[PDB]
């Protein structure tokens, strides 16, 4: 049938709609944040058009300023008949045509400046032309330079090296139910401060009214002296003991078919050597709660050296386990 | 009269004033920090104006230098003779007005050195003034691109993007009369570890005259783990369930109007991508806080898809609660 | 025989050997990401090399484009002809070898442009081979510049500063047993907001069959106000009081040489100089664990200060204690 409203997708990214949002409108701020943070194969496209762009737009205006002067009528003329008089006091030395006006555009904008095409003194447009281009190129060298250092201080980021299992599993701990996952670790370093929650997401109906349509419960992990900090270097498994207080007390095997119930499951911390936090998802429908199953074990030292072998990570293995509600099985204890 | 004096405005902004503090003066890194951090409308005004200025200075210096040394004399001299005679050794070649020497303080600042205007080994003040213009426009050159690239840097930061409510509500869940608002995020990146505290600034009385004016008092948010931290992907309802400890156990309706409250609500986290902790506060004062009414809930399921109707962002109906004080109905709920 | 495995070595540094993951594809991305974080000594190679390799390319480009046109005969002719019939022909002036191409490559490249071997405006080809020069010699020291910008910017940060004593104690302290080890810091700096944790790694077996092969226990560390964060300036000894729940709670004094233990520690913060959060582990296992000692005090006033004497951090000197297991000491109390 038509996909059931999942909160969040099996790798984070909640399939949510925001509409009717009020419009703040575009900015110009939107140009330069998607300048800043594009891909390779594109900074190195409009790094490339800026300059072939400035050089070709100064070339015109040089063009122009001595087509205006006569210098081009100077050294088409006098460059045939007669040398001297220096081509009557141009205002940029030895610029006679369009090819001329690109290469002196060049050569002012990257500072080469080979001196055959020399700028004179004889015309106080030509100086403004040539301070605006040098402030011109000033300007778009640095924000150039800033771009590529800003791909190269993220220079590091990958994906999320966190991986889950795609079954999570309800089965018998030291006495009781437990929903639980697996979690692992791809990165060679280890994350700091991790901490895991666990929420239940539902329709909830308060006596006197209110229907909140996705209510997220929260849920308490499993853990010795009630924290949440895990130490992820091997892949390990995360629980919770499904007691009087948690909305899973009143879920049967056989009404886990066709059941409201999404446990988001949200792991984040902080990464050793980068040093940005990072925030990993997943979430698992009823569907994908096995009842009955378990999670096999996966550490061995076969020599020495402890190993993981990652190839059974999601495994899951059929074990023998009640078939009621958590409720029942307290109901009618020792049965 | 004058509106009760807020302690942080709804914006989230502070009101109080802080005066008699003994001074320590403005110093001069206050002049640098206020230049990293300018409007680009400014940004681009010092960017240009740092250059020319740097130019013209030491466009005045050669011309000064050009004069004293007797060059100027030599080349009008050579003008009105007939042969240069090599201009007797100058300076610096070809720099015989004020113009040449801007066009000569260019190039050896933007580093063009077209070669017109060479610089011997003459007078050894020339070279002075040269190692002087080379390191000023290495430093100056150096600041700005380093103002560039932390602009570049700070691309990404914006103003707040979270979201309270106009006014909170108080009603009934549970038997229980609790005080509720709305919060909400207009950002993409989902806040790492958001973190939601409240309290209740008002002026207390202790017993042995310890007045305190604006006494900020902890109140706890209700939680099923008890503590702080949310998830926020759609909109949430913030809530505090008034009891024994609860601040509020006295209040009623009549008696709101009348009241020196107000509520203080901070939201800490960190931003996902640009990976800096934020901030936001808003506040709620006895006018705000509208008793009896409860919020519209907003998520709809349609399309197979969940959806959330921001239109509805602060819409709060008005539903039938109890007109009494907490500690009423909590003391006699029938008796 | 071959020495038992361990979980973390005694300085960090899991030595766990995860094999048989779903290897992926290697990127270009890798190898920009390698070349931005190098040793200096590796750095400085790469960044003449680059250098070397473009001048040297662009000359043999240069030299080519003067082969392919008619430069190299007729600068060849004209000094057998002694005559300048080779002035305005030329693709690029004075370029007629290929030491000449080379420098005229460096002086492209470097933005130096002596202006002995000027850019003519004749083939087209050689405005190309122009063009595509300074956009790839931008490009290249760019990438440098944000290589040397990267090493700058993480230069501060440095190697591990936090010692640990080499083996443990269980003593006796108001009491009961107590596991402690003493944790020091050589760094001249503040370890802003430290914490502490401790972890028992053991193979446990479940009554209802799941056998998990190095489970990790969580140990509560004992503080006053039940909580992690630590103070270090002097070195202080980090304690666990052996109660009911413990895992260390049936563990005698003889059998404490063959027995499946390992305490693992983890001590975080935040350093104060860049801010940069760190994590230092240690481990501890049954041959490095002293029963019935304690550490020597190390701080001694001199009357103006206090003295911290180093050379006696991992001294330990034998006393009294109950030579039997934790269990014992209670529900045999008369012991
Ligand atoms: C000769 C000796 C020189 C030695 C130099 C060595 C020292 C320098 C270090 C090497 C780096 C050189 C600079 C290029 C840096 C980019 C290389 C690499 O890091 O990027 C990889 C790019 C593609 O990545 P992506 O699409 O953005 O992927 C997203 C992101 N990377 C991610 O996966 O998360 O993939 C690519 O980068 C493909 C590049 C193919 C095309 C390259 C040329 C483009 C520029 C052309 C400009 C020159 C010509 C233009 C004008 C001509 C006019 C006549
Ligand atoms: C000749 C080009 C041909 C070839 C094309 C080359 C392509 C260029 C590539 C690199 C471009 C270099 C400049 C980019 C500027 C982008 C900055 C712009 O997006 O910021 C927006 C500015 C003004 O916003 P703000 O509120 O004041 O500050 C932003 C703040 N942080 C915020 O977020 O809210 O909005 C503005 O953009 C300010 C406009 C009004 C400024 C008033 C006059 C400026 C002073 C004098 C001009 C200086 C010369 C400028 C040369 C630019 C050309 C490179
Ligand atoms: C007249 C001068 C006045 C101006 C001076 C003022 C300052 C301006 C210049 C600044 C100099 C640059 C700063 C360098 C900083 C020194 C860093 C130093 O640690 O590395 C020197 C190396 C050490 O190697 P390392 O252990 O890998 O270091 C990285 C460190 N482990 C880390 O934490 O990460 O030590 C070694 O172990 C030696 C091994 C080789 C290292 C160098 C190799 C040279 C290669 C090429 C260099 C020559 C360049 C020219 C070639 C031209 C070819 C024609
Ligand atoms: C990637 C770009 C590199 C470009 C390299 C140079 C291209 C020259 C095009 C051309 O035909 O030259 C022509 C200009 O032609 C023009 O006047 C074009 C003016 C606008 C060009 C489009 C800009 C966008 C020739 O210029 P001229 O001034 O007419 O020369 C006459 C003087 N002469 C007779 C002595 C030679
Ligand atoms: C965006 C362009 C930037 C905006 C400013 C630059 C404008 C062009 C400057 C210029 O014309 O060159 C001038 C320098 O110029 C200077 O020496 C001072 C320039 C700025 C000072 C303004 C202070 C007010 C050159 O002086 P001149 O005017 O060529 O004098 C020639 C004498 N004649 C006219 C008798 C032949
Ligand atoms: C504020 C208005 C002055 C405008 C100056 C801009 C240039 C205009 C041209 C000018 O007359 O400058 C004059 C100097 O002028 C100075 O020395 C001014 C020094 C500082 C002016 C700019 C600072 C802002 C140029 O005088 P000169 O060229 O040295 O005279 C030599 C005679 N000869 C030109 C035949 C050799
Ligand atoms: C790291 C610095 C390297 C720079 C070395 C400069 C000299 C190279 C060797 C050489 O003798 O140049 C020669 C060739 O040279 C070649 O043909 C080499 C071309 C390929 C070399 C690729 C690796 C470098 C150049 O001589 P020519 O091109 O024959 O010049 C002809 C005109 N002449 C005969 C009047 C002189
Ligand atoms: C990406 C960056 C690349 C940028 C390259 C710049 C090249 C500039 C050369 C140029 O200006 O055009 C040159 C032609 O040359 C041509 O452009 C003709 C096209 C070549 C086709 C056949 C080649 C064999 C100019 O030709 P011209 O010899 O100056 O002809 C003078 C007559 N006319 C200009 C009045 C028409
Ligand atoms: N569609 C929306 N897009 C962006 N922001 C919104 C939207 N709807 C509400 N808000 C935010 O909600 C806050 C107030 O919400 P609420 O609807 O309770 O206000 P209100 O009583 O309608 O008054 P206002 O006229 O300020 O909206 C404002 O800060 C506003 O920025
Ligand atoms: N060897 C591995 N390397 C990297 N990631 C893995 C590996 N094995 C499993 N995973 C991750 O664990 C999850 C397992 O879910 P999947 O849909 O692959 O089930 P599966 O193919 O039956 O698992 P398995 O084959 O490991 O039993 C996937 O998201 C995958 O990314
Ligand atoms: N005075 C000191 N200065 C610097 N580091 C020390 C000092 N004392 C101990 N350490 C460090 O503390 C660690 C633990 O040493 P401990 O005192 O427990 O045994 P030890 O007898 O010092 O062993 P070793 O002689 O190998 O250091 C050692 O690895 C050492 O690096
Ligand atoms: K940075
Ligand atoms: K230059
Ligand atoms: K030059």
């Not at 190195?44 to 040089?62: G, H, K, N, P, R």
């Not at 006006?101 to 004889?122: K, P, Y």
Request: with cysteine.
């Amino acid at each position: 049938r038509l996909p059931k409203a999942r909160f969040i997708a099996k790798s984070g990214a909640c399939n949510l709609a925001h509409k009717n949002i009020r419009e703040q409108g575009r900015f110009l701020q939107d140009i330069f944040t998607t300048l800043v943070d594009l891909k390779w194969r594109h900074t190195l496209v409009i790094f490339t058009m800026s300059f072939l762009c400035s050089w070709l737009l100064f070339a015109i205006m040089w063009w122009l300023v001595a087509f205006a002067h006569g210098d081009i009528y100077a050294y088409m003329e006098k460059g045939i008949t007669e040398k001297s008089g220096l081509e009557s006091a141009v205002c940029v030395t030895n610029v006679r045509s369009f090819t001329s006006a690109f290469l002196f555009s060049i050569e002012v904008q990257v500072t080469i400046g080979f001196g055959g095409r020399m700028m004179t003194e004889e015309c106080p447009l030509a100086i403004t032309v040539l301070i605006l281009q040098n402030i011109v190129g000033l300007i778009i060298n640095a924000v150039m330079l800033g771009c590529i250092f800003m791909k190269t201080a993220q220079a590091h980021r990958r994906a999320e090296t966190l991986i889950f299992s795609r079954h999570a599993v309800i089965a018998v701990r030291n006495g009781k139910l437990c929903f639980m996952f697996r979690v692992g670790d791809l990165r060679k370093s280890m994350i700091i401060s991790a901490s895991v929650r666990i929420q239940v997401v539902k329709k909830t109906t308060t006596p006197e009214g209110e229907v909140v349509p996705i209510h997220q419960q929260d849920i308490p992990v499993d853990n010795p002296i009630e924290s949440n900090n895990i130490f992820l270097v091997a892949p390990l498994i995360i629980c919770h003991v499904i007691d009087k207080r948690s909305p899973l007390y009143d879920i049967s095997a056989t009404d886990l078919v066709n059941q409201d119930l999404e446990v988001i499951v949200i792991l984040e911390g902080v990464v050793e050597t980068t040093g940005i936090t990072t925030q990993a998802r997943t979430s698992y429908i009823a569907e994908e709660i096995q009842w009955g199953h378990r999670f096999v074990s996966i550490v061995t030292e076969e020599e020495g050296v402890y190993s993981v072998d990652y190839s059974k990570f999601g495994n899951t293995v059929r074990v023998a386990a009640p078939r009621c509600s958590a409720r029942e099985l307290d109901e009618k204890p020792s049965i």
